[model samples]
Target: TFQPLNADDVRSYLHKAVDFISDYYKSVESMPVLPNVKPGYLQDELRASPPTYSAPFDVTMKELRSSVVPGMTHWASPNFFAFFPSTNSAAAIAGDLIASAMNTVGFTWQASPAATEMEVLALDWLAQMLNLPTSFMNRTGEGRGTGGGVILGTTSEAMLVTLVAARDAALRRSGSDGVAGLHRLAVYAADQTHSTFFKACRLAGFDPANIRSIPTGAETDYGLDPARLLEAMQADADAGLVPTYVCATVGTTSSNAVDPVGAVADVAARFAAWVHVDAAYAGSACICPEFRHHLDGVERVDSISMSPHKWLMTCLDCTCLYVRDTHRLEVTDLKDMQVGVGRRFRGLKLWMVMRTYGVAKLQEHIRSDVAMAKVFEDLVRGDDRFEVVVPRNFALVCFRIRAGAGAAAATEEDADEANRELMERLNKTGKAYVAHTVVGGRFVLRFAVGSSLQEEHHVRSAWELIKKTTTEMMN
Candidate 1:
């Protein structure tokens, strides 16, 4: 029978594991990033059910080395120029491992006081780093509890929670039944906004009639048009609609679209709607001064939700959602909604990342990605065979196979299909992987640059693989 291991045994196991992962990252730089894999390939590999045999550690390790290691898409691979970068520094991962080992739950003060304090301090650190309005800070030194911050699972969860809180608040004021009469309340979002916005509204008991997707485009880099938002708000108000919230995207899912914060803030003010900036993919970029200007009007925003997991190098499920007044969040998350009357200690890992790497290092990581994006853009621009569907915004590069320069002319439907197929073939090749999106009803490939380990050459390697595969593809 296997028993608990001592310090030496644990250290030995960890040493090998660390070595394996370290070499894996280094090897990823050399490997053709885009896995030249086929559709049923991964599925077939995954088909085998869990074995009932009690295999030895060496046998298990052999399987991992031979099979699982190569099959991975390598989200941390430096050559990862596909969706948003999941930048996980060695330090952050260490913090995550520690958090996991500790296994402390922090739904309340009683559950884990240290966890709670760390969370509070972590958010304050983040708020300070981003230079958020003082009004949004906890009334610790100052006297402002109306606004502050908390950690959440993801931006989607935060948005959903916000919707619920806003709905509850609105219902109280309007004297409407909970969930039963939410049809009168509405949510306004830019077309470029992530689909999660709609999902959040729906999950919060609102019907499709309560949600409206406004048009967005080239002029504003897909950000919400405040004037357009206000026009719709006024129209909905006149029609007896309760405009409860306006979701302003900081960095949209499709090609890193950024919504106009100041303009949307003005419009939100007019309707007394809760404005939440969903900066899931781009919020980490704010570590750089350049991102600060992209969200010129963020000061007026009531709430902001973003994923540190995506670009901040924290692992999956580390999202921070800040609000001008955090009372709503603590009140709304249903802290005691769980079985044991407490939530888990979700803030420890994120706090450790904040402390060890600090904001400056995070900014450097983001800036490096930006520089890599430029390199990628130049690579695409250098070749007439590719066309940028949308100008590079932040770290996302939207472009696709150019038939032969002169902007490939095709119907909206045809273009979507063409680009989707192009993306499909690219992913199938596995030499490099790129994603697809439909912006303003046209399909576009997305080359998001944020992998923490991704270096300049990784971008070059991706381009090389892309060119090679495209030549083969055309044939």
Candidate 2:
């Protein structure tokens, strides 16, 4: 039997559904950022055995609010500043809604031409907004070569795939010279770079012994010391090992550090390395044009990647990976997975989003988030007992209690312990959420202000919560 819902049946329910989603965002301001429930508290409501029959929509949704919403830590709420924000906006959600309704699978040009084409257009628009080099914009070229962007799942996957492509390209060039599998290939990045860089090298067939970390410190902005990197590359060349890759940063995770891409590019040029920029948490700000300066000398870079999900107010899992050489990504990503398996169409929603929201509004969104972070920093600075541990780069603020918040943590190890305790206790308070990181050999709290609904008041409230909690410790 075929069952089709008439307009009378779904119109009211659809209205309710839309209302629920919108109301959640509207009410998001009043709710606690993190849930108040304890571990296993939600499990008490569920039966040990599986249900034999399906339930009504209202019943399932009721469970969603009661059982699921409580157990979940609200990652998208305004107070979720523990890590970088997993941003999502109403426009993007609407885009996802249209995509879900269409149910289009965009794998090839033949699969869903409109879906695929819209994706390319969206990326080109973003590329134009970011002022990416002509080589990467694909406006002048006839789609003849490797350049431009592809929507990916996350920056981690982009790094891994690009690393593989770079490694293979190196091997191919070396193979021609008969140095393949004989000379060691060196990978260069800041010692403070993300852990994914090391994982990428290993996944791409590079030997663990060849991965290198250029020593960095606060003096060098907590990124690859350009002088040290150049020295390391020169030393490797003299020793007959090939240096083929460099990963500079725009906003590092731990400290929100901004690496000198221009200097890094110059250093990589000496060794003919593929330079890739990871601006996962900060790239969205480039839509404003003024922030394009951070990507200085990006034209010479071989590739760059960013997570819109982190800073662009897009839904989760929307990452944009750009390569100056598209053939490289072809060799790396599309080369595997047996042509087509386990891959869902992702380009559609991103396209729908950029088209609907437009770049100007997107830039405004990012700027507003940046403004909120500055507010957070100001509030923290006003309190002399707390110190901003790392310099603000994009929208993240890393700070900690000055002099260990009245606790005794004289040595580095002891200080870490003290901060850890503070972090745990803060989590125990449901008012705000934050995370800690080891930056420049000290423990500091990380607060990223990119949540879509976050505003100045949320930032202010977060500071108040911190002060109240910290005072408890001191007293």
Candidate 3:
């Protein structure tokens, strides 16, 4: 066997990788936001079986460029309007490089003190920036140390961890003997809440029948109705079921609808249920006071999660969850905060990004996204053929092309068909990419401005493309 490669080999590969990354970013604007490849297209280019022989580094790089890059949807592209953002910045990239260089398995404080403390420090700083409850901080000062935050991988995992914690807490509350007491537990969320909530419930051992999907409609902006939730909890109690947890979404997946956290928590309290605030998309905007109203009752919730990777210019898989009680799970293992034990040094990326772009700059960035969204919203409202399906929230706009604005109204099916076709045509042009969602039984296009590189010009271009596509589709 050949000797292990030395530092020189690392330097050589590092430089080449940097070059490739820089080149790709430089040309990202020219590429389509979505990939052009079809299903099973990669099988046509590469062998299905495992390689019998080792390939040279250069050969692997060549194959990656030829076969893999084309199959990716460029989330970092300014034209990427589908879903929420997974922002990437230079500081985050550099931090990840350092993290990769020091591949530490930071499972506990003793394993890597820097890793653990840096995460603690970083999350504390973030908590301050967002004006989070002091109960969530790890400081030794006043009103601190009782609770803390941890950097998890995603909101789904955060929900899962918190759901487990809440379940145990409820068990303790009801004087259950042990884990087997988890049978009668039920969880709650709005119908428009992200499916991740239900998935977390399933993973947390809650039965399908025990999962309550509280219904809401356009009247409430698709938010979970507190009265309905109270009734649901009451009915469950009447049926001898334990209401253990309720997920109140700040920014729902469907239309970015914000539920009444305070009211929901009131109901949760009546039933001794743990309340979790899931702010997967809109939580970053809470840094700005003007937009903080959406998180008005956040402090009252038992736990809250925000995705820095979604909008804070961090790289992938960085979500922070703050709990009111650090040891609420009745275990000493920090591993309980997450589903996995071997965690990445994700805090480094968030620290780097937050420091590189200070709080004010980050606030300005989010404000710009909202302003750009307003620009698009105004454009849509200005035209007669399009109708704003729901009012703009944060940086997401929902609208649909009118089926028959001037004359007899078209059937709901026809309107949905027209809007769907218009969206497909706009995305097919490769000029911009957007997503669609159904709100109030109406299909509408969703334009989300979460890319760190997006600006007024990009929004204007998207509006132009959408209008042009609508004109073509109508005729």
**In what order do the candidates fall by TM-score, top score first?**
3, 2, 1
- Every candidate's lDDT: 0.73, 0.75, 0.84
Across 439-475, the per-residue lDDT of candidate 2 in tens digits comes to: 7777788887877777788788878878887777666
lDDT of 1 by residue, 1-475 (tens): 4654667657776777788888887777666556556666655655367777666566666667876766667776665667676767666678767776677877666677687777777777777777777756664454444566667777788888778778877777677875566778888999878787898888888879769999977787676788889889999889988889989887778867777788888888887888888888878788677778766777787788778888877787678877775555422223421223444566667777877777777787788878988898989989876778767778888887654422332445544555666677666655556777776665678888767766687678778877776666555
- If the candidates were sorted by their lDDT against the true structure, best first, what order would they fall in? 3, 2, 1
Pairs that clash in candidate 2? 146-326, 147-326
Question: Which ranges of candidate 2 are over 4 A from the true structure?
Answer: 2-16, 29-31, 36-44, 48-50, 140-146, 176-183, 325-342, 404-418
Local accuracy of candidate 3 as per-residue lDDT tens digits, 46-66: 989989987766887788889
Instruction: Give the distance in Å from residue 390's predicted Cα in candidate 3 to where it truly belongs.
Output: 1.1
TM-score of 1: 0.87
Cα deviation at 103, candidate 1, in Å, is: 1.0
Question: What are the RMSDs of all candidates, in order?
Answer: 3.6, 3.4, 2.2
Model number with the top lDDT: 3
In candidate 2, where is summed lDDT lowest over 10 consecutive residues?
330-339
Q: Deviation in angstroms for 76 in model 3?
A: 1.7
